[PDB]
C-alpha cells in the first residue's frame with residue numbers, strides 16, 4: 029500500500045476539503061496554514077495594525093487531525109533572500125509567524141520551497157526556529173529534479189534555451205539542497221520533498237539524490253500521460269523512478285488540478301497503488317532485512333563477550349551458510365580418505381568455536397553423505413553455550429562428539445586433528461578476530477591438516493549517504509570523546525546509500541599460516557575511480573571466504589551467496605564529509621593494528637583531499653584479545 | 654433591501670474595481686482570513702452606494718477567492734480564481750443576477766492575473782504555476798499554453814488594439830513582449846540593468862509601442878518597445894507597485910497602486926500631481942469614471958470604496 033497526500037494551494041472550507049480528499053483515498057493533506065495571497069506587514073503603518081484574525085481558528089479540526097492529517101505550507105510571497113531590504117525583513121517575521129503557528133498546531137511536517145540558488149537567510153530563519161524549543165516536527169524542502177529555468181519552453185526569440193550538455197549545470201538543484209542542509213548543520217528535522225518534472229533529467233542527475241534524506245515525492249497531474257481507455261498513466265522511465273522511490277518508503281504527494289475530467293482524483297492514486305502491487309516481491313534476504321534498513325548496530329565481539337541464547341538462534345536460522353559448510357567437509361573427507369580406507373581410517377574433526385553445535389551437526393551429516401568414519405571435538409569458551417553442547421552430547425550425539433569447555437588458544441589437545449572447522453568470521457571477515465584465534469590453535473593441527481575456512485578476503489567500497497552520516501553523528505554519548513562515534517565500524521543493512529566505486533580487496537588471511545614469523549598486522553592502499561559528482565560519508569565493508577576449494581560464502585554485492593542473510597555489511601565512517609568531483613579518485617589507507625591485549629582498525633582518506641587518521645592507537649574502538 | 658441570490662455580507666478584502674462604459678461599478682471581493690476562504694462578485698449601478706451590501710444591483714458568491722478581475726464586453730465577467738480555474742460569469746437580461754457561464758480548471762496553481770484581448774473573443778491568464786494560457790471565451794477552451802517564465806507570473810496585460818500582442822511579467826525578472834503570429838512569441842525587454850523584480854504592467858491607450866511598469870521597490874518606469882532601454886523612471890512608492898491604470902483623457906494621467914497604503918497620480922513625465930493616504934490597507938485596484946474623467950475609484954483590504962477628485 030502507498031501512503032499518499034494531496035497538495036492544494038486553495039482551501040475554502042477546511043472541514044469540507046479534508047473530507048473530500050479522505051474520500052478520494054489520501055492519507056494526508058498538504059495545505060497553507062495562512063492564505064497564500066494574504067501578504068502581511070510587520071513594520072510600516074497603517075498596514076502593520078491590520079485588524080485580526082490573521083488566519084482560520086485551530087478549533088476547526090481536532091488535535092489528532094492536525095498531528096496526522098495536515099502538512100503545513102509556507103506562503104509563496106515569503107522571500108527571506110530577496111534583494112529588497114523591506115521584503116527581506118517582512119519575510120523573516122512572516123516565516124517565523126507561519127512556522128510557530130505550525131508548531132502551535134503540532135503538524136507532523138511543514139513545506140518550504142528551494143526554487144533558487146541563494147537560500148542562506150531562509151536557512152538562518154529555519155535553523156533559529158529549530159533551536160527555539162525542543163520539537164520532533166519535520167520540515168520538507170520542496171526541491172525539483174529539474175530547475176523551472178532548465179525545463180521552460182523554447183519560445184523566447186532573443187533568449188533561447190541552452191541546448192549544449194552541462195554535466196554540473198544539470199545537477200544545480202542538488203547543490204541548492206546541499207548548501208541549505210550544510211548551513212542548517214545536517215538537522216535530522218530537515219528532509220527532501222523531491223518534485224518530479226514532465227521530462228526526466230539524465231540518470232546522473234537522478235543518482236545525485238541517492239543517499240539523501242527523501243521523505244516525500246511530489247508528482248504533478250501534468251506529468252501523467254493518457255492511455256486508450258482514458259486512465260492517467262506514466263512513462264517506462266517515470267515508472268523506474270517510482271519503483272526506486274517505493275524502496276525508500278517515501279510518501280507520494282499529488283499536486284495540480286484534474287486534467288483527466290472524465291475520471292476522478294482517485295484515478296492518479298489508483299495507478300500508484302497498481303505499481304506498488306505489480307513491483308517485484310521481497311526475496312529471502314529482502315524480507316529478513318525489513319526493519320534493519322539503515323539501522324546502526326555495534327559489531328559483535330564473541331571472544332570478549334559471551335553471546336545470548338537468542339543471538340545463537342538468529343545464527344542458526346540461515347540454511348545456505350551451514351549447507352555450504354556441510355558440502356566443504358563432505359568434499360574434504362573424500363579427498364583425505366579413499367573408498368578402500370572408508371572403514372579402517374577415522375578422520376579427527378575439531379569444531380573450534382562450536383556454539384550450540386550447528387557445525388558439529390553439519391560435520392555429522394557430511395560424514396553420512398561421504399560414508400566416512402569421523403571423531404568430533406566440540407571446543408567452546410562460552411560456558412553458557414557449553415550447557416547446550418553437553419545436553420546435545422548426552423541426549424543425541426553420544427561418545428562420537430567430545431565437548432571441550434576451554435579457549436582454542438589455551439586448550440591442550442590429546443591428539444592432532446586432520447580437519448579444523450570454524451565460523452569465527454564477521455562482517456569485515458577478520459573483525460571478530462578469526463586469524464588470532466586460529467594462529468594459537470593450528471599447533472594441534474596435523475602437518476597435512478586442512479582448515480575450514482582456509483582463506484578469507486575483506487572488501488571495501490566508497491559510499492555516499494547523508495542519511496547514514498547523520499545517523500552516526502546522532503550516536504554521540506556522554507563520558508567519552510564527542511567524535512568517537514565516527515572512529516568505529518557499524519554492522520548495518522545499507523539501504524539509503526550510493527556505491528561510488530566497485531569493491532576492492534582490503535585484507536587477506538590464509539589458514540594454516542605456514543609463515544615462520546606470523547604477523548596479522550596489515551597496511552593497504554586502495555584507489556577508487558569515481559565517475560560521478562558526490563560527497564563521501566564512509567566506506568562499506570564486505571567479505572569473501574573460501575571454506576574448501578569451489579565452496580564459498582560471500583556478502584560482496586557482485587558475488588553475494590543467494591538466500592544467505594547471516595552478515596549485514598559493515599560501515600567505516602569519516603568525521604567530516606569529503607566533496608568528490610567527476611573523474612576524481614578516492615584514495616583510502618586502511619591499517620589492521622594490534623598488541624598483546626587488543627586488535628583495532630585505523631583508516632584515513634588521502635585523495636581528493638586529506639582526512640584525519642581515524643581511531644589512532646584504538647582510542648575509540650578496540651577488539652579485545 | 655438586497656437583490657435575490659446576493660449574500661447578506663460582503664468579503665472584507667476588496668481585490669478589484671472596474672467601471673463599465675455606462676457608469677456601473679464592478680467589484681471583486683475575497684475572504685483571505687476567517688473560517689471560509691471563498692470569493693464574491695458584485696455590481697453597482699450607483700457607485701456612491703458601495704461598499705454597502707443592501708444597495709447593490711447584482712451579487713453572487715464564487716467557490717474560491719478572487720485574485721484578479723476584468724470586464725468582458727458589457728455583461729461577461731472574467732474571474733482569476735485561487736482554485737486554478739479561469740471563470741466567466743455573465744450578467745442576465747434584467748442585470749439583477751450574476752450567472753456562471755464556464756469554470757475550467759486548467760492552471761495547476763492560483764490564477765493571479767487575467768486580461769481580455771482587443772476583440773473581446775479571446776483572453777490571456779497568468780498563474781503561480783509559471784504558465785500563461787490563451788483562452789477562447791466562445792469555445793470555453795485553451796488555444797495555447799505557454800511556459801516561458803521561470804517563476805510565478807505576476808501580471809498579464811493585453812495590448813489596446815492588437816489581438817496577437819500582450820505583455821507578461823514574473824518573479825524571474827523577465828518582461829516578455831508577446832506576438833502569437835511569431836514561431837517564438839515571447840521576447841525579453843526592459844532596461845539596461847536587471848534591477849528589481851517587475852510587479853505591474855500598463856499599456857499606453859494612445860501609443861501602441863509605449864508602456865509603463867512598476868517594480869517591487871516602488872519605482873515606476875516609462876518603457877518604449879523599439880528602444881529596449883528605459884528612458885524615464887521615478888521612485889513613486891516606498892513599497893511594491895500593485896497596479897498601474899491610465900485615465901480616459903486625450904493626454905492620459907497614470908494612477909499608481911501600492912502596498913504602502915497610498916495612491917499617486919502622475920503625468921507624461923511621471924511627476925507627482927495628486928496623492929491620497931485614505932486607505933488603511935493595501936490599495937489593490939483603481940478605475941477611472943467614464944462619465945467624469947476627473948473621478949478615480951480605488952479599493953483596498955480595509956473594505957473601503959474611496960472616490961477621488963483628480964485635479
Ligand SMILES: Nc1nc2cc(C[C@@H]3CC[C@@]4(O)[C@@H]3C[C@@H](n3cc(F)c5c(N)ncnc53)[C@@H]4O)cc(F)c2cc1F
Nearest residue numbers: 330331343381383408409410435436451454465594595
Ligand atoms: N557476525 C557473525 N558472527 C558469527 C560468529 C559465530 C561464532 C560463535 C559466536 C559465539 C561463539 O560461541 C562462537 C565462537 C566462540 N569463540 C570465539 C572465540 F574467539 C573463541 C575462542 N578463542 N575459543 C573458543 N570459542 C571461541 C564464541 O564464544 C557464529 C556465527 F553464526 C556468526 C554469524 C554472524 F553473522
